C-alpha cells in the first residue's frame, strides 16, 4: 500500500507489461512492498490478471513465485483454459472447505477442464447410500 502498491495494482490491471516487470524486480531487491497485497476487495494481483485473462502477466508472475493460493479455483469458476493450463503443471478463503478442483470443475459443464483433470487423474468421492 502506502501509495506504492497502488501503482503496481493499477499497472497490472491496465494491461501494462514493462512497468509491472520493473516493479517486480525492484521490490524484489528493496524489500519495500509485498508482491501479494490485496488492497481493494481482497484481490491479489494474480487474481486481477486472472479475471482479465491476460496470459502474459500471469506467466510472468509464475516466474517470481508469488503465492498462488486457491487461484486455480477462481480460474475454474471463470472458465479460462490457459490459466488452468499453466497452473496445473509445476488464510480464510471464499470457497467452502469441501470443494476440490474436480467438484467445481464438474459444477460447470465445460468439456476442456474435465478432460484435462481426468488426464492428470483424480477420483471424486462417493456418498454412502441411505
Amino acid at each position: 500500500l502506502s501509495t506504492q502498491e497502488k501503482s503496481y495494482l493499477s499497472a497490472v490491471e491496465k494491461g501494462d507489461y514493462a512497468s509491472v516487470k520493473l516493479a517486480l524486480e525492484e521490490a524484489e531487491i528493496y524489500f519495500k512492498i509485498n508482491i501479494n497485497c490485496i488492497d481493494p476487495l481482497g484481490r491479489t494481483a494474480l487474481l486481477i490478471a486472472i479475471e482479465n485473462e491476460n496470459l502474459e502477466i500471469i506467466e510472468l508472475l509464475l516466474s517470481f513465485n508469488v503465492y498462488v493460493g486457491d487461484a486455480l479455483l477462481h480460474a475454474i469458476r471463470k472458465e479460462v483454459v490457459g490459466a488452468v493450463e499453466l497452473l496445473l503443471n509445476h488464510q480464510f478463503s471464499d470457497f467452502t472447505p469441501d470443494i476440490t478442483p474436480i467438484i467445481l470443475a464438474a459444477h460447470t459443464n465445460n468439456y476442456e477442464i474435465i478432460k484435462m483433470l481426468v488426464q492428470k487423474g483424480v477420483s471424486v468421492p462417493q456418498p454412502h447410500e441411505v
Binding site: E13, K14, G15, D16, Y17, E51, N52, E53, N54
Partner: peptide, 22 residues
C-alpha cells in the same frame, strides 16, 4: 466480462505500441 476484456486488450496493445515507438 466481455467489456472488461475488450477494453483491457485494447489498452495493452496501446501500451506495447507506445513502448516500442521509442
Amino acid at each position: 466480462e466481455n467489456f472488461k476484456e475488450l477494453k483491457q486488450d485494447i489498452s495493452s496493445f496501446r501500451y506495447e505500441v507506445i513502448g516500442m515507438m521509442k
